[model samples]
Target: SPLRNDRLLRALRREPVDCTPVWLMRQAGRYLPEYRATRAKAGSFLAMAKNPEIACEVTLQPLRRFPLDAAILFSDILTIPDAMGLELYFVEGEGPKFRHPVRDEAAIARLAVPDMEQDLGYVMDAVRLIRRELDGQVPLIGFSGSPWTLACYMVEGGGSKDFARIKAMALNHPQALHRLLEVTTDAVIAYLGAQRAAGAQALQVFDTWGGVLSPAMYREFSLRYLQRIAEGLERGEGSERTPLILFGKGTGLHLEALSQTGADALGLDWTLDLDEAMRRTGGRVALQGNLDPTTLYASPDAIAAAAARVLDTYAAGNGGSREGHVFNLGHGMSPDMDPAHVQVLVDAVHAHSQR
Candidate 1:
């Protein structure tokens, strides 16, 4: 399978490229009309995500409209918890929730790593089918919710503003929380391994809630598992070349530690400057993003200028070369984002980062 574009993979490996590779988080989400129409026909978010045919279709939607460098599987991170029998569902105006949140020790003890093929094979199917549909147009990135982030949802039942339940458990019930995280870390390793076997070109771990913990607690609960996953998947194997990108929303200060993990790239939130992050990590891993996602609300010219600012900072960090960088927003796309704005941003990155 010869790829028409290998820029994303090349960038992730910190190799030379003609321009900065560009792909945003949640690129195949609600911002597109085609995705909305597909969801309407499918009737529910879970329904759309769980069906291999529809999920594969959604995965390619953005690529058809924009020159994105990668296609992330169009599935929710909650799929793992759903396979654990928590019965994940989405509510209008709200977000993903579970029928049974793993709140206490009993539920945590009852959890098990799912049979990847028998239980959550739909996700693997989506990855394989998307690969086939892509016909080597671009690299396909498979991802998971990080151990601690997934544990947060399992304990809190859904998205939270302050993440109270999980934090309290970490302090008051330390052993119980460790057990939860231990099992979760194993599950993530297994889940990602399955994705790799299913033809995913690269993988990413989304530690969306890792920033919620303080430094010491973050190391104990979050970073420890991330390192384990790195060891499990990326360390010392003949076939262990697939790049692993680790992304945390508010982990500005932990870039150095995160780079120490066996991951190949570190995804940045908008809060940190890319130049500073590169200096901190010593350019040990490729850096993916740090652009404010909301900058798209400006005029197209303004969006390009903002994108150039990120590009300049990256070159400054990389000694005036555009190698080892990928252009993306600090976070996922919003449902309200204009498709035109997204185009402007994408073109702007490639335009400004020209070698």
Candidate 2:
């Protein structure tokens, strides 16, 4: 039998476990000194992602200093779009931008699903490199932006505070938006499948902007597409390796439905009550996250206390099954975040989980 991070994967399945595993979103970015050095060497964000050596180096940077239970492949979700002829870039002070957005039928017609091995060799190479480096110690999480999320970036051309233009487009020209999502979903399925083929253990589909939709609209647009992608994914070649994780930023309202998406775990943001989330979820899948990233900026004691609160919420009881919890922040790590401070959180979670 092949090695699976069965402990962590079991935790995700809401099964028995000795302790809660911990890992952070954006854990391998703009935080460590070595990562900064590598980023400087690579020049631009896209360039850094394009280089597998730099990407794998930065991906393992945090783990060198901490005892994390997972290693997410340090690559941008936007890389898929960039490879599919989108020409993605980042400005000095600004965020990601798309050089050629697919808005009208003409641009959408120009768009087509890319061959991952051919067009996204860089991304798959990073996954294989990081997998080799990880040495089967912990599972490597492979991820992609949800179809609607990639469409938002493609149509809006960049990150927007309010996502005004994309929202307006969705409101006024819904048919076009649906067309865009349909194509993106197909591409994402292929992209994620290729990554799994390359050595990824678990997969996460980041619906970054899914919260911006109404419940009705969310189910139709965001949730349905994710379900479609999940239905298409191949976690292991045969009957091994279970698929795990479906995370939606700002989709806290739909935790129950999110849990029902057939994912092994639902990544919870800090907004909702973890206890209530577990209750609503009926312990069907393990719960990962609900930590506020800002708490790390405080003293070590503060971080410890904050961690205790999260643990208390998912406290275990008498049974074969343990409360499934993977300690993580509600969102991505901040650029100015101290990598040492994160180590403090990891240590605290380990000690607290013991008690």
Candidate 3:
């Protein structure tokens, strides 16, 4: 089937579209009763995410609920860790937990790249399934956590407030951290590559914790591995071409450097203005997002007004062309959002930016 909507892909490549394209991150999550029910039926969070059929169901859940322009694979960022045999599990009140945490030099040395098919191929299965089910309605986005971001989980054993475990290793056991990142970097590049081969039309690297490091540590531990993945990977050709987006929360300080990672676009955090982001990056790549996700908690009128402001600000920033900008929340939509509020935001994005 031919794609019916290419605005999301077009915007990513800096091409003009009839209007601004809008999609929210974590679009497939707890806000919808249907998604919640699906999660319930699957029993546990890990069980739900790992099941390919359920994964595809949740992936398309948001699309049925909204006129979103892309479908991100409904999977965890730490899938690779599970595939690597760390045994990823979720706690009732807490987040992800790994049975085996990579802490010492021997632990780092034992890490090996998981064979995509032999290991975490459930992700690939969902990718192919989601594409077939999409019928070319829009693009499917395949994503992974950055090496350093993944390393944080691998070393810290789960979500962290201070990230002191990995930080101390970085300072005292720098070699340990490098080897961890190096191995995971190869794993991620292959993971994304297999995703594209399986039918994911675009890809993204979520550098969720990259911003916690100093500029120097970020470059060495995070950006360096990101650069390798960008360089090592191959994308589709011609109309089949796939675009890669790099998203790092609290990363405005290194926007220019992030822009140089060979990523097609940079996903901005809500802390800064899109106009200022464009000026700082200077047209080196396309830009996506900067909308505050919390706005959805406000009234529909306020949400639409905020959407208008993001559109107007982007219009003022990008030299009057509608190319190179995709409307999205700076971070991701949280579970607390009212689903209908997203409708107003999406409609406002199109209404205010119609060409």
Candidate 4:
């Protein structure tokens, strides 16, 4: 199916576009009333995410409300770990909790890389359904949690304040940790490959906790696996054309290495100067985001102004062209955010970024 809007896909490949492509992380989340209704009917986050029909419905919800350039699959990153038989669940106020967290070598050894087609078929079902429902209106994005990030939760059992347990495993039982990552990386490759075959037009890998390690530790543990995943997926016969995005929060220190990972784009957090990143990467990868997610809380005029500032800064520093930029919030939209305000930001990006 040809896309009515391939701007996001083009921008990821650093191709020229009339305006910067725009999409938001967590675009179909709790901020929308329709999303809330569907979520309520489904009962829980896992329930909604696991059901193909409900997941496909929420994936299309935001695109109907906002002129987003792409639609990301509505699923949780922890789904892979959950399928590994960890029994993933969410606390009301807190985040994800794993019933059987991996603690020592025994647990790690017991872990099996799930069969994507047999274990996680619901995710592919949603991808196929969403693509069919979209009717080529826009590109569909598929994503997975980076092996290291998923391992963090698996070792620690949930979100952490200090990340002590995972680091202990890394520093003490290094081989054991690598064993887990090796399997996890293979799973990601198979999982993402399945998504591409199922109908995902683009892919993203979320390394949400990569920055927590020292540079040396990060290289050995996180960055290395990301490189393997990128190289593995890109070298596949049919998978080469699907653009890969690598996003590591607080990854300002590893911009150059990230650019060299064979990923098509690097997602930026608000902390890094986008121009400096472009210069460092030497325009080898497309750049997405760096806008403060909180900026949308201000008046519409202020929101647009902030968005324009991002647009102008990237252009003026990167040779004044809309060749490889995708406008997005630095992070996922907060559940507490105003939905209408996102409209203001979306409209402003397309309007202000006109070439």
TM-score of each: 0.97, 0.93, 0.98, 0.97
**Cα deviation in Å at residue 140, candidate 3?**
0.4
Better of 2 and 3 by lDDT: 3
Clashing residue pairs, backbone N/CA/C < 3 A, model 1: none
Q: Which ten residues in a row have the lowest lDDT in candidate 3?
A: 235-244
Model 3, clash count? 0
Give lDDT tens digits, candidate 2, residues 1-355.
2544555665665665677788998888777788788888878887778889988888888888888888988888898778779898888988889898776878877778898888999899999999888877888889989998888898888887777777887789888788888988999999888998898888888888898888998898888988887677766532255566878766667888877877778887888867777777776767888898998899999999899888887663213233677778888888898877898999898888872
**Local distance difference test scores for all models:** 0.90, 0.81, 0.88, 0.90
The segments of candidate 1 whose C-alpha lies over 4 angstroms from its true place after superposition are 234-240
- Ten consecutive residues with minimal summed lDDT in candidate 4? 232-241
Instruction: State the weakest 10-residue window (summed lDDT) of model 1.
Output: 232-241
Give the residue spans of candidate 4 off by over 4 A. Answer: 235-240
The per-prediction tally of clashing pairs is 0, 0, 0, 0
Give lDDT: candidate 2, residue 271: 81
Quote the lDDT for 319 in model 3: 90
Model 3: per-residue lDDT, tens digit, 135-250?
Answer: 99998999999999999999999999999999999999898789899999999999999999998988999999998999899989999998998889998554456888999887
Per-residue error at 217 for model 4, in Å? 0.2
Write one digit per residue (lDDT tens) for candidate 4, span 1-355.
Answer: 6788899988888887888889998999888888889888889998889889999989999988899899999998999999999999888878999999999899999888888877998999999999999998999999999999999999999999989999999989999999999989998988999999999999999999999999999999999999999888843432237889999777888999999988889998889778887888888899998898989789999999999998887886688876789998888888889988999999999999887
Extract clashing residue pairs from model 2: none
CA shift of 67, model 3, Å: 0.9
lDDT of 1 by residue, 1-355 (tens): 8888989888888888998889998898899999999989999888888899999999999998899889999888889999999988789869989999998899999999999988999999998999999999998999999999999999999999999999999999999999999988888999999998888888999999998888999999999999999998742333337889999887889999999887899998888789999999997999999888899889999999999999899889889888999888898889999999998888888888888
